[PDB]
Amino acid sequence: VNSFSGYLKLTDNVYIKNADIVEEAKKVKPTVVVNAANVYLKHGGGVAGALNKATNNAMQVESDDYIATNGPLKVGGSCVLSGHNLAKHCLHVVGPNVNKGEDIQLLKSAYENFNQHEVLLAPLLSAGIFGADPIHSLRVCVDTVRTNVYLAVFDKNLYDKLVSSFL
Numbered sequence: 001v002n003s004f005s006g007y008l009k010l011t012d013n014v015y016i017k018n019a020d021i022v023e024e025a026k027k028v029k030p031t032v033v034v035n036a037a038n039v040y041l042k043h044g045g046g047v048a049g050a051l052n053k054a055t056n057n058a059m060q061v062e063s064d065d066y067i068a069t070n071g072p073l074k075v076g077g078s079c080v081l082s083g084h085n086l087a088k089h090c091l092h093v094v095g096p097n098v099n100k101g102e103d104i105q106l107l108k109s110a111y112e113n114f115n116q117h118e119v120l121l122a123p124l125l126s127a128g129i130f131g132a133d134p135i136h137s138l139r140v141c142v143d144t145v146r147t148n149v150y151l152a153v154f155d156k157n158l159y160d161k162l163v164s165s166f167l
């Protein structure tokens with residue numbers, strides 16, 4: 001039993017809710033919140049910009065130190081950093097950005113990072129400003145993640161389409 005409330009169960013291990021991931025994180029304080037990161041951990045917009053704003057820029061400060069030490073992530077890769085006031089940990093995961101020409105096949109590799117964590121709150125990788133089809137992102141998630149994932153979908157119209165079209 002966990003504290004996530006109001007989610008629709010899609011499969012044995014995947015759940016979904018029309019919600020703002022920032023407000024969901026602040027309420028639940030999950031062990032892991034997933035960020036829709038880029039390889040530079042520049043959290044300027046989308047989910048990343050919103051999550052970073054909620055930490056009063058502390059996420060960006062920590063991220064800049066991480067990059068100065070380690071260099072950029074790989075597309076499809078991840079790193080674990082602090083969750084600040086939102087969660088114990090933040091798993092920064094880099095899905096492919098279609099608006100940069102990146103291979104959509106890397107979306108499966110991106111979701112594989114979730115399997116290193118028993119329970120996560122997450123957005124649909126490569127959705128929103130990353131330019132991929134959210135229906136596809138959801139299919140890859142369900143077919144790749146085996147741990148317990150709670151998906152927060154900001155847009156109500158998109159959430160209804162994702163539910164109504166789910167096989």
Ligand SMILES: Cc1nc(C(=O)N[C@@H](CC(=O)O)c2ccc(Br)cc2)c2cc[nH]c2n1
Nearest residue numbers: 020021046047050127128129152153154155
């Ligand atoms: C769960 C959650 N999702 C986002 C978000 O940016 N969602 C994108 C998708 C994406 O970026 O993955 C989207 C927004 C509108 C339309 Br129409 C289509 C896609 C934010 C932003 C602040 N809080 C958030 N909480």
